Amino acid sequence: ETAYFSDSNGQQKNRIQLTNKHADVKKQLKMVRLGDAELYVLEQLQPLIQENIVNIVDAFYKNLDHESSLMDIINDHSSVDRLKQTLKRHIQEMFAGVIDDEFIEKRNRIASIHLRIGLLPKWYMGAFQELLLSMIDIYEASITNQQELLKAIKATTKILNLEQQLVLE
Amino acid sequence: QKNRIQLTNKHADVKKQLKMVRLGDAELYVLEQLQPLIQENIVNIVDAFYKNLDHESSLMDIINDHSSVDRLKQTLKRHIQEMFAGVIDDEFIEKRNRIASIHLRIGLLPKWYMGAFQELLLSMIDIYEASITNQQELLKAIKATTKILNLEQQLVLE
Numbered sequence: 001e002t003a004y005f006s007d008s009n010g011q012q013k014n015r016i017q018l019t020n021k022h023a024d025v026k027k028q029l030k031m032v033r034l035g036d037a038e039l040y041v042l043e044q045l046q047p048l049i050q051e052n053i054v055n056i057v058d059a060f061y062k063n064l065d066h067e068s069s070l071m072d073i074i075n076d077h078s079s080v081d082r083l084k085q086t087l088k089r090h091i092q093e094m095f096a097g098v099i100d101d102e103f104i105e106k107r108n109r110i111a112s113i114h115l116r117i118g119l120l121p122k123w124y125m126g127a128f129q130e131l132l133l134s135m136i137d138i139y140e141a142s143i144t145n146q147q148e149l150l151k152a153i154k155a156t157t158k159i160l161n162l163e164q165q166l167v168l169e
Numbered sequence: 170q171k172n173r174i175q176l177t178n179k180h181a182d183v184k185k186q187l188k189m190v191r192l193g194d195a196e197l198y199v200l201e202q203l204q205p206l207i208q209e210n211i212v213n214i215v216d217a218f219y220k221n222l223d224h225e226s227s228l229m230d231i232i233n234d235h236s237s238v239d240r241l242k243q244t245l246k247r248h249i250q251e252m253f254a255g256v257i258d259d260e261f262i263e264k265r266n267r268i269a270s271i272h273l274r275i276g277l278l279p280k281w282y283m284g285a286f287q288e289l290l291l292s293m294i295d296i297y298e299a300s301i302t303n304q305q306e307l308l309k310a311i312k313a314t315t316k317i318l319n320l321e322q323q324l325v326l327e
């Protein structure tokens with residue numbers, strides 16, 4: 001049969017570039033078992049994710065109007081239409097297959113931003129779940145090997161958990 | 170699935186929170202359905218949890234300052250099993266809250282708290298892959314499990 005993933009170990013090295021500024025982050029990646037192999041997997045999903053980001057962002061803002069105050073927050077500072085563009089690029093930065101200082105530093109920046117505008121952490125956390133769900137949905141439609149499917153899901157739960165760790169608290 | 174979510178107006182936001190992770194009756198029924206699977210591997214799930222913590226010396230230090238891994242696996246076994254009870258009520262929420270506050274008083278960092286939930290998920294996804302053949306039921310169980318663990322992080326972060 002055909003496979004979705006390449007297993008090219010030549011291809012999956014050096015995907016963690018962290019200095020001592022980010023000395024805890026290397027521990028954190030080790031605990032969620034985020035490594036070269038998982039990052040290479042992330043990198044190969046990026047096309048799927050890219051091809052589907054518009055559905056992923058639409059679904060995300062749609063979910064948020066379950067809580068009117070989250071929408072007030074958005075409309076006080078911006079608009080959905082304009083947050084989508086930046087969410088597209090953030091989501092896609094998750095599937096780049098490299099964790100480095102800049103990656104971290106950008107995550108700390110968006111954290112501070114949500115802190116400022118008053119997002120409460122439980123809505124922040126809840127919001128990552130529509131992402132997960134839309135991704136799983138994209139995987140299933142496109143990855144019909146059951147074993148490769150699980151592999152895409154596990155990698156994804158890993159990168160999302162690191163995302164949540166970065167923004168908290 | 171019956172009437173598995175039984176919250177009073179003091180937990181108004183939690184209701185919204187549930188709707189937003191799509192944790193309703195169907196998903197709770199699924200978790201209930203998974204409970205026997207989960208109970209039959211709880212010892213190993215919890216062995217793996219603490220094993221994984223040992224990679225961060227400061228986490229085990231907090232644990233040994235306050236308690237111990239042997240006493241801690243008894244409450245964790247029970248906590249995880251209650252996760253698949255298939256019912257969310259005021260007391261379920263209320264315990265998660267008290268358990269949270271213990272962790273802030275002991276000085277557990279929320280990054281670490283957060284990573285810790287991934288470990289459980291992984292052990293859980295491992296069991297379902299070994300145990301549930303049909304791909305759709307398999308996705309259904311991971312999705313459910315994923316919802317409840319997200320709730321659990323929300324309530325801790327409250």
Ligand code: HEM
Pocket residue numbers: 064069070071073074077078083086087090110113114117119123124127128
């Ligand atoms: C997984 C969840 C989320 C991610 C990854 C995320 C990410 C981002 C990013 C990358 C930006 C930067 C935009 C810029 O450059 O100005 C941003 C902006 C913003 N986000 Fe989020 N966001 C998330 C959830 C939320 C939620 C739940 C709300 C709703 C309250 C929210 C409200 C905002 C607002 C209002 C801004 C700033 C607008 C401005 O002043 O320009 N975010 N978010």
Ligand code: HEM
Pocket residue numbers: 222227228229231232233235236241244245248268271272275277281282285286289
């Ligand atoms: C998925 C994450 C976690 C869950 C679900 C969890 C759950 C629990 C539960 C149910 C209790 C007992 C509360 C009670 O007495 O009612 C407990 C105890 C405790 N947990 Fe956690 N825990 C988690 C992560 C952690 C981590 C990562 C650490 C530190 C390495 C930690 C340290 C402790 C300690 C030291 C206590 C209190 C012992 C005492 O004061 O006697 N927990 N946890």
Ligand SMILES: [C-]#N
Pocket residue numbers: 083084087
């Ligand atoms: C933040 N969109």
Ligand SMILES: [C-]#N
Pocket residue numbers: 241242245
């Ligand atoms: C908390 N083990």
